[PDB]
Amino acid sequence: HHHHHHPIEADYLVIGAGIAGASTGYWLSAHGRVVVLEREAQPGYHSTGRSAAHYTVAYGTPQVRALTAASRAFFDNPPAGFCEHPLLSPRPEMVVDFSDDPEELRRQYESGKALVPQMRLLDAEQACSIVPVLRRDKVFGATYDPTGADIDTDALHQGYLRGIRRNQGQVLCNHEALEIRRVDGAWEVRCDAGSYRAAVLVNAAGAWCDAIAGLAGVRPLGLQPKRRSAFIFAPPPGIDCHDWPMLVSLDESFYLKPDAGMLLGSPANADPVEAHDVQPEQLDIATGMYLIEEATTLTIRRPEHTWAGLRSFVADGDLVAGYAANAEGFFWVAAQGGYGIQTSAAMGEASAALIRHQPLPAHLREHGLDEAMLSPRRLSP
Template identity: 55%
Template sequence: MNQDTADFIVIGAGIGGASVAYWLSQRARVIVLEGETQPGYHSTGRSAALFMESYGPDQVRALTRASLGFFRNPPPGFGEHALLSPRGAFMFAAPGQEAALDAHEATVRATSSAVQRLDARAALELLPVLRPGQVAGGVLEQDAADIDVDALLQGFLRGVRRQGGRIVCDARVGAMRRSGGLWEVSAAGTTFRAPVVVNAAGAWADAVARLAGADPVGLVPKRRSAFLFAPPEGMDTARWPMVLDVTESFYIKPDAGMLLGSPCNADPAPPHDVQAEELDIALAIDQIERQTTLRIRRPTHVWAGLRSFVADGELVGGHDAKLPGFFWAAGQGGYGIQSAPGAGRYYASVLLGAAPDPQLAASGFDPARISPSRFTLP
């Protein structure tokens, strides 16, 4: 069999492409094309991922719930370390913002996650760097957990290779055409062929669609910046939860002995190797110093990633209604890692014509809500 021919070509080896390829490769021949020199170079490799059942729109939360079993008990040989580690997530409100905190609490309580409402005194005991008088209380989502993003991505990719799949890096797609029931995809000086292409190109998904002759879905990449800074000398922050204010103007999260901060920005940007803007970092520092007693003299590292959204914020997953053999696995927004096991497994079941995981329906997942057909004009 020609090694450049497969049952499926997956474009993109970030978490979206790697997860669907993992399940596809168990039953089919798969080639994954990655435009960069290494998988996960863009959004996946720049994520401060947290597993939060309350995070994201309705269908994202359903796919996240359906992913929990995989995160807790990955298949034998998937990796050497646990994918989740305890963290917790704490959202606090200032006086006058209690209604917003009530709404957040209701969302968390609608999940299976353990939740605790804290008054101002308890909030200050949990996080002594919050400013007294500026905290009305908070909500602690106790089951939120850090995700080992690299372990998850590499586990998916190892599985693809172990099952006979091929991952080709430095393979940016230059042209695509459909001929005789096969896609011919030009990349890395080679023409790869398969009857089905999976568009998991992240921020570049609409560009890939245009190459194929498909209508774009209105994907908007948005810049999210982050930075590392030193915690106060002598203060043990390792067990802090992730902390964010109810208006989501910033968050703080412990990270390998440092603190990771972000302005929670979502600034539209073209798909590119995005870098943090100085203003993003300055705004985050200002918000953190206004609402806490932390002082940030100089970040030790700054970066940014692109989180790509469609208008309703949900994922985009399914066959293109107008273009045979073209499948969308895009629009992960800021939720692609926590939902990857559930989404990847669902996409593979559709592509293989198999029954979907029963856990999806039990989690409240509705395939029509993420279908690319919702963008198709009559």
């Protein structure tokens, strides 16, 4: 009974315009008609705008580390015209043992060194020389990754979206997918003003990927969104922190990193929650501030900014890029966890290749990636 536009035909409908949908759509867009359907009025309102992203490697898991390592080539040397300014800024990471767990510290050093030969093992004095506000009594040693970097997430994100548009793709905000149905050989998505059809449905909906499967009648993966809060605060007068590394506790109880001339802190939490527009909890912010004030001489005045975002995982902690078993044309780009920005170039290129029934590109295979490692089929016996 209500008017709708005539349906729009495409080759791939991408649900979600965050880093997952943008990166996959970027690499698809040279090959066919891409339409990205995004619920919000902007593409980076959810997790992709909430990360203050950092890059490493040295450290998630074999699959995560391989996706991250394979992404660096694009970040450091993206195609001409992709963006105006460098995407990465140097920002070593120092993981400090505040627990007195030398065996764990040595484990993480040996493991990181295997992918990052410049990985170093520091004693407590060396850690305190690098971040001089550390309390020496609280520090037992550290690892140091000289190769870490900060990511200009908004430039990267906007570069992917711009590339889609330059290849005649569409990025449509205020286009929540409300219904999804397999109709005459295509996936057909109803948005509030009209419908969209394509042989391939690319589910890149962040914390909402299982909700999208629910609209489509496709068995979900068991994705678990987890809240992480962060805040920005001023350093004390006389503390010149702008060149400090990313500092993380060995047991991931907190982290602290410069963000320009301010400091970013976080309790590095992972509280399981439903997919929603998540807000910071006061106990998260108070805990992060408490732990920083205990580990360092800093005292924290009232934050300038607080927020939280969702880091969404499947059971094994690995990302998912692959067609659903038994659901023709439904492709998952999911379970980015805490790693969606730093893995986005390899995930985007790999997912687009697999959607198109193509082998993974050599340079990805050389970093120890294969289709099986990415597939949702591994979550089932």
